[PDB]
Design a protein. Structure first.
Length: 537
């Protein structure tokens, strides 16, 4: 039990009469100690109220002799948060949530989902989609294809220089992309309020037929097949479900889905609302179940093969002899020495059920306050998540995302609404953005500065800091330190580790995972540019 009001009175001594702010601390402490509630969030919020009142005092009376005792109380409060979190756990809701928005769900994605379904038959599978937006990826590809050609045409003379910097290509192409996105967006805005009440796909189809030489019947067949396919495979529509109830969040989702065509960012929003509203486990479609821990304990990893590649090899081995997933790569497995291969084969073929190879989730016991997350390279990654319905931490991540977009949009909206070209819009946005820099936010600003070109130019990675892992990392800081909307503070490793998605419950290093991971550095830019120039007519 936290120290009593009477004990703090002893320790927090001063020649001075009790300050109002100190009386408030004592009341808040007493009221925490006297709580009869069994509600963990209620307890946490009272602790937060107390902690905040301590900071008010210490920041106002910076040389008070009470500060040593108050600082010690703050250290005890950090521990109390952990006691509350670990005081109670119970199994997460037996739901698996996947998301595929913006086009036809791939056969490969369905094969990966099937592994989870087969192994966890008692879990309810939801494959979230947007019933109005099956043509978003088609539109983005059309815009990028057209802009690539335009940029090569404009730059043809300059490209013959052996010292041509492909960044001029990516920059010029982004100018064409931005203008094409703007023409679509403005057309959308002119139509969306009509009494005919058109859908997003109605508008995309019209625009593609008008401006991109597409056939209406072909596009409609793709749209209806996409809808049938996803509904036949655990599909649940975000729109029919009314998953969004906050206009602010719907607007964030829409700015990614419609204005930017960033389906990854759109899915970042949907996965959070799915967990908030239903609870369970969120998985990217390239995640696979964990392999039984002892399955390959009798095979030793060669010194020449790294830890991650060895994980890849285990899955390659399984899929070579079981073929659960069709045409799975055997690239790394095939390079193994023959006795190792023979060894994998004996073990794998000795098993008769898939349940002898992959392990079940069973009960994933969590605190009702928390969210758990996958790690990659010691950092959180939102490709897999666990949370009970309505958890405080999931709500903190949502609050982080809202706060980050509010800041982004405060600076970006006036620039976009000026209706300038890409170059001038970017300058207006940046000038406003960087004039708001502080010691607290400066790296955040730098990370969101290239927002408009995410997905289209190398090294533009703003998503991480808006809807992705950065929002989660800051929410964990918020949780542990009883704060709200911190920006660039992060936990030490030992405070973060308790929130890790259990390793035995997840195979992250899959063939599709390795393909789908961000690679648009300067080296990939050069390779893509070579292929563009090669294919240029």
């Amino acid at each position: 039990s936290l120290i009593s009001k009477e004990e703090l009175i002893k320790l927090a001594y001063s020649i001075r009469p009790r300050e109002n702010e100190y009386k408030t601390i004592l009341t808040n402490l007493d009221e925490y100690n006297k709580l009869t509630t069994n509600n963990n969030e209620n307890k946490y919020l009272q602790l937060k109220k107390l902690n905040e009142s301590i900071d008010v005092f210490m920041n106002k009376y910076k040389t008070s002799s009470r500060n040593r005792a108050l600082s010690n109380l703050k250290k005890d409060i950090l521990k109390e948060v952990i006691l509350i979190k670990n005081s109670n756990t119970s199994p997460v809701e037996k739901n698996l949530h996947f998301v595929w928005i913006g086009g036809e769900v791939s056969d490969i994605a369905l094969e990966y989902i099937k592994q989870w379904a087969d192994i966890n038959a008692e879990y309810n599978i939801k494959l979230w989609y947007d019933s109005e937006a099956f043509l978003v990826n088609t539109l983005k590809k059309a815009i990028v294809e057209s802009s690539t050609t335009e940029a090569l045409q404009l730059l043809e003379e300059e490209i013959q220089n052996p010292q041509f910097d492909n960044m001029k290509f990516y920059k010029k192409r982004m100018e064409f992309i931005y203008d094409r996105q703007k023409r679509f967006i403005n057309y959308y805005k002119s139509q969306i309020n009509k009494p005919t009440v058109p859908t997003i796909d109605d508008i995309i189809k019209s625009h593609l037929v008008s401006e991109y030489n597409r056939d209406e019947t072909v596009l409609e067949s793709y749209r209806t097949n996409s809808l049938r396919k996803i509904n036949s495979n655990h599909g649940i529509d975000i729109r029919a479900n009314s998953l969004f109830t906050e206009q602010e969040l719907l607007n964030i989702y829409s700015q990614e889905l419609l204005n930017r065509g960033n389906l990854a960012a759109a899915s970042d929003i949907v996965r959070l609302l799915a967990l908030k509203n239903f609870g369970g486990v969120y998985l990217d479609v390239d995640m696979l179940p964990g392999i039984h821990s002892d399955l390959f304990k009798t095979i030793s990893r060669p010194s020449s093969i790294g830890l991650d590649r060895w994980e890849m090899i285990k899955l390659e081995a399984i899929m070579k002899y079981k073929k659960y997933i069709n045409n799975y790569t055997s690239e790394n497995f095939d390079k193994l020495d023959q006795q190792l291969k023979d060894n994998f084969k004996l073990i794998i073929e000795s098993k008769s059920e898939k349940s002898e190879i992959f392990s079940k989730l069973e009960n994933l016991n969590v605190s009702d306050l928390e969210i758990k997350i996958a790690f990659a390279l010691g950092s959180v990654i939102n490709q897999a998540l666990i949370s009970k319905q309505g958890s405080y931490l999931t709500n903190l991540v949502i609050e982080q995302v809202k706060n980050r977009y509010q800041f982004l949009n405060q600076h970006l909206n006036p620039a976009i609404e000026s209706d300038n070209n890409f170059t001038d819009t970017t300058k207006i946005f940046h000038d406003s953005l960087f004039n708001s820099a502080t010691a607290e936010n400066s790296m955040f600003l730098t990370k969101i500065a290239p927002y408009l070109q995410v997905g289209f130019m190398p090294e533009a990675r703003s998503t991480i800091s808006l809807s992705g892992p950065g929002a989660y990392a800051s929410a964990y800081y918020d949780f542990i330190n009883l704060q709200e909307n911190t920006i660039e503070k992060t936990l030490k490793a030992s405070d973060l580790i308790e929130f890790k998605f259990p390793e035995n419950n997840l195979s992250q290093l899959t063939e599709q995972e390795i393909n789908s991971l961000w690679s648009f550095d300067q080296a990939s830019a050069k390779y893509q540019f070579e292929k563009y120039v090669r294919d240029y007519t």
